[PDB]
Design an enzyme around this catalytic site. Structure first.
Site, PDB file in Angstrom:
ATOM      1  N   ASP A  34       0.315  -0.994  -0.438  1.00  0.00           N
ATOM      2  CA  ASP A  34      -0.194   0.099  -0.259  1.00  0.00           C
ATOM      3  C   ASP A  34       1.089   1.198   0.114  1.00  0.00           C
ATOM      4  OD1 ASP A  34      -1.851   2.366   0.399  1.00  0.00           O
ATOM      5  OD2 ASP A  34      -2.334   1.457   2.207  1.00  0.00           O
ATOM      6  N   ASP A 214      -1.953   5.373  -5.391  1.00  0.00           N
ATOM      7  CA  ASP A 214      -2.469   5.293  -4.347  1.00  0.00           C
ATOM      8  C   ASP A 214      -2.900   3.600  -4.547  1.00  0.00           C
ATOM      9  OD1 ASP A 214      -2.459   3.767  -1.409  1.00  0.00           O
ATOM     10  OD2 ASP A 214      -4.853   4.843  -1.855  1.00  0.00           O
TER      11      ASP A 214
HETATM   12  N1  LIG Z   1      -4.327   3.275   0.608  1.00  0.00           N
HETATM   13  C1  LIG Z   1      -4.142   3.633   1.674  1.00  0.00           C
HETATM   14  N2  LIG Z   1      -4.616   2.392   2.558  1.00  0.00           N
HETATM   15  C2  LIG Z   1      -5.239   2.644   4.018  1.00  0.00           C
HETATM   16  C3  LIG Z   1      -4.736   1.780   5.166  1.00  0.00           C
HETATM   17  C4  LIG Z   1      -5.584   2.092   6.160  1.00  0.00           C
HETATM   18  C5  LIG Z   1      -5.187   1.444   7.288  1.00  0.00           C
HETATM   19  C6  LIG Z   1      -6.048   1.057   7.766  1.00  0.00           C
HETATM   20  C7  LIG Z   1      -5.504  -0.215   9.312  1.00  0.00           C
HETATM   21  C8  LIG Z   1      -4.132  -0.075   9.432  1.00  0.00           C
HETATM   22  C9  LIG Z   1      -3.554  -0.076   8.368  1.00  0.00           C
HETATM   23  C10 LIG Z   1      -3.841   0.945   6.876  1.00  0.00           C
HETATM   24  C11 LIG Z   1      -6.094   2.833   6.438  1.00  0.00           C
HETATM   25  C12 LIG Z   1      -7.053   3.914   5.470  1.00  0.00           C
HETATM   26  C13 LIG Z   1      -5.824   3.594   4.214  1.00  0.00           C
HETATM   27  C14 LIG Z   1      -6.682   4.291   3.134  1.00  0.00           C
HETATM   28  O1  LIG Z   1      -7.801   5.032   3.451  1.00  0.00           O
HETATM   29  N3  LIG Z   1      -6.168   4.410   1.611  1.00  0.00           N
HETATM   30  C15 LIG Z   1      -6.529   5.254   0.829  1.00  0.00           C
HETATM   31  C16 LIG Z   1      -5.550   6.697   0.850  1.00  0.00           C
HETATM   32  C17 LIG Z   1      -5.798   7.379  -0.842  1.00  0.00           C
HETATM   33  C18 LIG Z   1      -6.074   9.051  -0.257  1.00  0.00           C
HETATM   34  C19 LIG Z   1      -6.112   9.095   1.232  1.00  0.00           C
HETATM   35  C20 LIG Z   1      -6.402   9.763   2.399  1.00  0.00           C
HETATM   36  C21 LIG Z   1      -6.408  10.893   2.982  1.00  0.00           C
HETATM   37  C22 LIG Z   1      -7.609  11.661   3.518  1.00  0.00           C
HETATM   38  C23 LIG Z   1      -7.985  10.623   4.117  1.00  0.00           C
HETATM   39  C24 LIG Z   1      -8.728   9.728   3.752  1.00  0.00           C
HETATM   40  C25 LIG Z   1      -7.902   8.802   2.198  1.00  0.00           C
HETATM   41  O2  LIG Z   1      -5.474   6.790   1.702  1.00  0.00           O
END
Ligand SMILES: Nc1nc2cc(-c3ccccc3)ccc2c(=O)n1C[C@H]1CC[C@@H](c2ccccc2)O1
Length: 329
Positions: A34, A214
């Site tokens: 990720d 992403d």
């Molecule tokens: N790629 C990704 N990985 C995540 C991993 C986690 C996560 C949760 C628990 C353990 C480890 C990782 C939570 C949310 C995201 C998550 O929202 N994303 C999406 C990216 C793309 C935009 C960015 C984002 C920025 C602001 C608000 C919401 C999302 O995050």
């Protein structure tokens, strides 16, 4: 190969996984790779929920190189919570190894059902230091500091469903993964792999929009204002009463995304954001596009983008490299 490659496997053309090892005895784990987060999450033997019993678990007691940390990590969401603590141990990515501070996951009380049904063990972040919990330098950054790789960069060549396997490469760029020109876009911030591009769909235009690359996102995210205007009279219908968009697979009115800059032009055709749903109807497809609004007009270029475009992530040059991925290896 003078670089470090890890094979990527596709999961129903919605997500991909990669395997890495944790511990002295190199305990194997299946990871979600990720670029939208920046920590390494590994399930622990100390996790005793039903879901964890079916996963590969990290036993620190069977690793000589395990170094106790103990710093508590409790990430809260609604839906649910992920609890754990920090640990340091030898992390092997491909044929490279280094002591690395990761998160030992004890409790996943929110995500228990989906996690179980999921075929991955943990999550390996590939974002920037400022995106991480507890100020942790990215693996690729750490590896180069330790003179273990040529360049502080990694590259993604995603697998295509029923066509071919994919590769995560660390430390160098290989010509075999892409065709056409390889163009760089410098980051607008050292947090996410976010670049500044102008987006165009038909005559609908949005300029200098923040575009986040992403691999953790299964869809393409578009500003809601931008989405409604682009889906005007294209024989595309919204589901009642949800934000699902459905269309015929052969819809000739379906537009192509165009992201342009001073150095490159990036397009995403209907064949990349359409998901077949022959269950509900013959020749029926769903638009893998989500209307999502951030404080700044932001596009999220998830898997459908990287599925088409081989991507380069350069820490040293603070840039993203983008090129047409080869359709065959
Ligand atoms: N790629 C990704 N990985 C995540 C991993 C986690 C996560 C949760 C628990 C353990 C480890 C990782 C939570 C949310 C995201 C998550 O929202 N994303 C999406 C990216 C793309 C935009 C960015 C984002 C920025 C602001 C608000 C919401 C999302 O995050």
């Amino acid at each position: 190969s003078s670089n470090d490659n890890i094979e990527l496997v596709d999961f129903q053309n919605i997500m991909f996984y990669g395997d890495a090892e944790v511990g002295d005895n190199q305990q194997p784990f299946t990871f979600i790779l990720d670029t939208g987060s920046a920590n390494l999450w590994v399930p622990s033997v100390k996790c005793t929920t039903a879901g964890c019993l079916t996963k590969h678990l990290y036993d620190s007691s069977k690793s000589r190189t395990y170094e106790k940390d103990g710093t508590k990590v409790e990430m809260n969401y609604v839906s649910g919570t992920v609890s754990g603590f920090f640990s340091k141990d030898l992390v092997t990515v491909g044929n490279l190894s280094l002591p690395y501070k990761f998160i030992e996951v004890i409790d996943t009380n929110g995500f228990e059902p989906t996690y179980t049904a999921s075929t991955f063990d943990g999550i390996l972040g590939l974002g920037w230091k400022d995106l991480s919990i507890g100020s942790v330098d990215p693996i690729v950054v750490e590896l180069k500091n330790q003179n273990k790789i040529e360049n502080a960069l990694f590259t993604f060549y995603l697998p295509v469903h029923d066509k071919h396997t994919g590769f995560l490469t660390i430390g160098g760029i290989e010509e075999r993964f892409y065709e056409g020109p390889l163009t760089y876009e410098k980051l607008n911030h050292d947090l996410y792999w976010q670049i500044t591009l102008d987006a165009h769909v038909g005559n609908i235009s949005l300029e200098k929009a923040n575009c986040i690359v992403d691999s953790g996102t299964s869809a393409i995210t578009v500003p809601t204002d931008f989405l409604n205007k682009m889906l005007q009279n294209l024989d595309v219908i919204k589901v009642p009463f949800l934000p699902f968009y459905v269309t015929l697979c052969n819809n000739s009115k379906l537009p192509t995304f165009e992201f342009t800059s001073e150095n490159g032009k990036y397009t995403l055709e209907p064949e990349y954001y359409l998901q077949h749903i022959e269950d509900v109807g013959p020749g029926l497809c769903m638009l893998n596009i989500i209307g999502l609004d951030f404080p700044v007009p932001t596009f999220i270029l998830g898997d459908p983008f990287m599925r088409k475009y081989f991507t380069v992530f350069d820490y040293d040059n603070h840039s993203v490299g983008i090129a047409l991925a080869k359709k065959n290896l």
